[PDB]
Design a protein around this nucleic acid. Structure first.
Ligand SMILES: [Mg+2]
Ligand SMILES: [Mg+2]
Length: 734
RNA sequence: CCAUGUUGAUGGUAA
RNA sequence: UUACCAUCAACAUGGAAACUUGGCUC
C-alpha cells in the first residue's frame, strides 16, 4: 500500500510511539463455581489472591489480562463475607496475542491515564489541564490554563499515542463576587447564571447551573454536621460570606464560594481587542503545539513514579514525536478555452478564470431582473458592471428586462416572476435582488423557479452589491455562477486513464424532520468529467433507500449510453457521510445490493472501486523546517505507519491552509476490483479535488461529494421536494 | 463529554 | 443568498462515561 509519485517530504506528526518489550500479554477467563452476586466482591476476591497472579492484574469483572504465564487451569479458594460460603475461583487460559494487537488497547489507555494522574493533572471531561503552568492576563480578571488530551491507539506501525492541546479559560473572581456586584447595583441579574458552566479550581468536579435560590441553606447544616464542616472535609475551606445563596443543578445543590465561571465572559465578547488578544493565546502555530507536546513528554520523563507505573507493563514512551516521510503529489494542469496553465504553489487560480475565456459560454438574450423600489441605483450599476466584465469571461449578455416591485411582500415577487415567465416562455434566467436577510423570500423564489416552473434563478442580496471597490469581484463570481447554472463549463483537468465514470454520494441528515435522510447522487455523463447528472432520493428507511439508488444507477448508465454510445467499464463511488462504525456494514451489505442491479443489463461486467471519505480526523502534520515547524504544503499524501491495518487507505492534504496545523482527509477503499495501483487512486482523487465549479481553487473532498452535499442541502433544506427532471442535465443547484 | 445538523457573531481571503 | 476559510457561541437529534489496584456526588 505504498508508492512513489513525487519529491519526498520529512513531515512530523503529533504521535508518540510506544515500545512494547515482552511478548507476554495473556488473556484469562475467570469464573466462580459458587455464585457471587457483587462485582465489588469479585474485585476484592482477585485482590486477596494477587500474590500468585502478581500485581499487574487488570480486571473488568469477567476477563483478566496478565503479562506473565500461569498454568492452564488455576484453582484458588476463599470464603465469602456475606454468605460465608467456600467460594472456589477458577481461572483458565484463553489465547496469546501480540502486545500490540488492537484487543489490549482499552486498558493500556487506562494505564496511561493513571500515569497522567500521577503527574498532578485534573480530569475535566476527557482532557488533562495543568493549573500551575497558566497565563494570567488579568485584563478582566482572567487566567487561562492549558491542557492536552492524549489517547493511545494502534495503527499499522504499532502502538501510537495521539496527543493534542486544548486550552481552557477561567476567571479569578468567584461567582460570589459577581453576585455581590448584582446585589450592589440593584437578584436582578442572577438570571444570567443559567447555562453557565462553573468550576471548582481544585477541579474535583465541573458543573452547569439552571437557577439560584437565596435563602434555602446559607446558614444551615448539611446532612451528616455544619455546611462549613463538610466543605472543610472536602476542601478545607473557610467561607467568606455566611449568607451566600445556593445554586441549583439538575436535584444537586452547589455553592458560590468555590464556583468559578468558565469561558469568555459575556462582556469580554463585545470587546474587540480583548477578544483578539485571547485568540492570540488560543490559536497556536505548529511551533507552540510541538512545544506543549514536548513539555508533556518531558514532564512524564522527569517523574520516576509515572515511569514506574508505565513500565510495569513493559511499555516505554520515546523522547520525541514520530517522524514520517510522505510524498508531495505533482501539480495539475488546468484547462481553459485556447489556454491552459499549471497551478500555483498555493493552489489558487482565481485570477486566471476571470481573465480568460471558459470552455462553453452560451449567450444570454432573454432574462428578467426583479428588484424593489429601494435599490434603484445599485441595481442599475450592477447591470452595467455585469456587462463590463462579460467580455473577458467570454459571455454575450443583453440588457435585462427590468421589473419594478411595488413592495417587499413575497406575493408580489412570486406573482410578477410567474406572470413574466408564463407570457414570455423564453426567459432563460431569473435574477432577484432581495432587500434583506429574508429567508422566506429566498425559499419561495427557489421553489417557484425549480419545481413549479423550470428556470434557473440567481439571488443577489442588497448588502453584497452595496459596497463599491468590491463590486468587480462580486460581479465576476455572480456571472460565473450564472454561466455554470446554464449548462456551461468553466475549466477542466485531464484524466490519464480511459473510460471511467466517477460517481459521488453524500447525505443530509435532517435535524428534526423525522430523519428524511436526503442522499445526493452526482455521476458524470461525459468522458472529460465535465458534464454531471444529478438526482435526489427522498427515503427515510435505510433498508428502502437501496432500491431507489439502484434505479438511479441504471438511469445514469442509460443516459451515459444515450449521450456517448458506449457504456463505461469502471465505476468509482466516493460514498460520504458515513460514520466509522457504519463503514463495515456499508462494506458488507449495501455495496453488493447496489451492485446487484447490474443484472438489469446483459453481458455488462463493471469494475467498481468504492471509497469512503470522512473529513473529521484528529491527526496533524507538520513540515520540518530547520529551526522550527511550519504548516504542510497542499497536496501531501501519507500512507505509512499511521493508516489502518485491515483496509488500503491514505491521508491526503489537498487544500491550502493559511496557518497552524493541517488536517488531512481519510480515504478508506472498501472495494477494489479494477486493480488500480495506490499511486493511481491517490493521484485520481487529487485530480478530482480540483473540479469544484464554485470556488476557484482546491477543496477538501472530491468535487462530486461537494456537489452531492450541495444538492442534498438545496433539496432537503430549501425545496423540501424533488426538483424537476429537465433541470438535472446541468448544475442547476449551485 | 462526544458526534450529527442547523442558526448567529467576529476575523480573514479574494482588483 | 458572490464563494471559500478559521474561531466562538447557542439550540435540536442521538449516544457514551470515570472507575482499575477500582472514579463518586453534598
Ligand atoms: Mg460531502
Ligand atoms: Mg449559490
Amino acid at each position: 500500500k505504498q508508492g512513489s509519485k513525487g519529491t519526498p517530504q520529512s513531515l512530523g506528526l503529533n504521535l508518540i510511539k510506544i515500545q512494547c518489550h515482552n511478548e507476554a500479554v495473556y488473556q484469562y477467563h475467570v469464573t466462580f463455581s459458587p455464585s457471587v452476586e457483587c462485582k465489588s466482591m469479585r474485585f476484592g476476591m482477585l485482590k486477596d489472591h494477587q500474590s500468585v497472579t502478581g500485581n499487574v492484574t487488570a480486571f473488568d469483572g469477567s476477563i483478566l489480562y496478565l503479562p506473565v504465564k500461569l498454568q492452564q487451569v488455576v484453582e484458588l479458594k476463599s470464603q465469602r463475607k456475606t454468605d460465608d460460603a467456600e467460594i472456589s475461583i477458577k481461572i483458565q487460559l484463553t489465547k496469546i496475542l501480540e502486545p500490540c494487537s488492537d484487543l489490549c488497547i482499552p486498558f493500556y489507555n487506562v494505564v496511561f491515564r493513571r500515569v497522567m494522574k500521577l503527574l498532578d493533572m485534573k480530569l475535566v471531561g476527557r482532557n488533562f489541564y495543568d493549573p500551575t503552568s497558566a497565563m494570567v492576563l488579568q485584563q478582566h480578571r482572567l487566567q487561562i490554563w492549558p491542557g492536552y488530551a492524549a489517547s493511545i491507539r494502534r495503527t499499522d506501525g504499532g502502538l501510537f499515542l495521539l496527543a493534542d492541546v486544548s486550552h481552557k479559560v477561567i476567571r479569578n473572581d468567584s461567582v460570589l463576587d459577581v453576585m455581590h456586584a448584582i446585589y450592589q447595583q440593584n437578584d436582578e441579574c442572577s438570571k444570567l447564571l443559567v447555562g453557565s458552566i462553573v468550576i471548582t479550581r481544585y477541579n474535583n468536579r465541573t458543573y452547569r447551573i439552571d437557577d439560584v435560590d437565596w435563602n434555602k441553606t446559607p446558614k444551615d447544616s448539611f446532612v451528616m454536621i455544619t455546611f462549613l464542616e463538610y466543605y472543610s472535609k472536602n476542601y478545607g475551606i473557610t467561607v467568606k460570606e455566611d449568607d451566600q445563596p445556593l445554586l441549583i443543578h439538575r436535584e444537586i445543590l452547589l455553592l458560590p464560594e468555590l464556583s468559578f465561571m468558565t469561558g469568555i465572559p459575556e462582556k469580554m465578547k463585545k470587546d474587540f481587542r480583548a477578544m483578539k488578544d485571547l485568540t492570540q493565546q488560543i490559536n497556536l502555530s505548529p511551533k507552540q503545539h510541538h512545544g506543549a507536546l514536548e513539555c508533556l513528554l518531558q514532564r512524564i520523563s522527569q517523574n520516576e513514579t509515572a515511569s514506574n507505573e508505565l513500565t510495569r507493563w513493559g511499555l516505554s514512551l520515546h523522547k520525541d514525536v514520530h517522524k514520517i516521510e510522505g510524498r508531495l503529489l505533482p501539480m495539475e494542469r488546468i484547462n481553459l478555452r485556447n489556454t491552459s496553465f499549471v497551478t500555483s504553489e498555493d493552489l489558487n487560480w482565481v485570477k486566471e478564470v476571470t481573465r480568460d475565456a471558459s470552455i462553453l459560454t452560451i449567450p444570454m438574450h432573454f432574462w428578467a431582473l426583479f428588484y424593489p423600489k429601494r435599490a434603484m441605483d445599485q441595481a442599475r450599476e450592477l447591470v452595467n458592471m455585469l456587462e463590463k466584465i462579460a467580455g473577458p469571461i467570454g459571455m454575450r449578455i443583453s440588457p435585462p428586462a427590468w421589473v419594478e416591485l411595488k413592495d417587499d411582500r413575497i406575493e408580489t415577487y412570486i406573482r410578477t416572476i410567474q406572470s413574466l415567465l408564463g407570457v414570455e416562455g423564453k426567459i432563460q434566467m431569473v435574477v432577484c435582488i432581495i432587500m434583506g436577510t429574508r429567508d422566506d423570500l429566498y425559499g419561495a423564489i427557489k421553489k417557484l423557479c425549480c419545481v413549479q416552473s423550470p428556470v434557473p434563478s440567481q439571488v443577489i442580496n442588497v448588502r453584497t452589491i452595496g459596497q463599491p471597490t468590491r463590486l468587480r469581484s462580486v460581479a465576476q463570481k455572480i456571472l460565473l455562477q450564472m454561466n455554470c447554472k446554464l449548462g456551461g463549463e468553466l475549466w477542466g483537468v485531464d484524466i490519464p486513464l480511459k473510460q471511467l465514470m466517477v460517481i459521488g454520494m453524500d447525505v443530509y441528515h435532517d435535524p428534526s424532520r423525522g430523519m428524511r435522510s436526503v442522499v445526493g447522487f452526482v455521476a458524470s455523463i461525459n468522458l472529460t468529467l465535465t458534464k454531471w447528472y444529478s438526482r435526489v432520493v427522498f427515503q427515510m428507511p435505510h433498508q428502502e433507500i437501496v432500491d431507489s439508488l439502484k434505479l438511479c444507477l441504471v438511469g445514469s448508465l442509460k443516459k451515459y449510453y444515450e449521450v456517448n454510445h458506449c457504456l463505461p467499464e469502471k465505476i468509482v463511488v466516493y460514498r460520504d457521510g458515513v460514520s466509522d462504525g457504519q463503514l463495515k456494514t456499508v462494506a458488507n451489505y449495501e455495496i453488493p445490493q447496489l451492485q446487484k442491479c447490474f443484472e438489469a443489463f446483459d453481458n455488462y461486467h463493471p469494475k467498481m472501486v468504492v471509497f469512503v471519505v470522512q473529513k473529521k480526523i484528529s491527526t496533524n502534520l507538520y513540515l520540518a523546517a530547520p529551526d522550527h515547524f511550519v504548516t504542510p504544503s497542499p497536496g501531501t499524501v501519507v500512507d505509512h505507519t499511521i493508516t489502518s491495518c485491515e483496509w488500503v487507505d491514505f491521508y491526503l492534504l489537498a487544500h491550502h491552509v493559511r496557518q497552524g496545523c493541517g488536517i488531512p482527509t481519510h480515504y478508506i477503499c472498501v472495494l477494489n476490483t479494477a486493480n488500480l495501483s495506490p499511486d493511481h487512486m491517490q493521484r485520481l482523487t487529487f485530480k478530482l479535488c480540483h473540479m469544484y465549479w464554485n470556488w476557484p481553487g482546491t477543496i477538501r473532498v472530491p468535487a462530486p461529494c461537494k456537489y452531492a452535499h450541495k444538492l442534498a442541502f438545496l433539496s432537503g433544506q430549501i425545496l423540501h421536494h424533488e426538483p424537476a427532471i429537465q433541470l438535472c442535465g446541468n448544475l442547476f443547484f449551485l
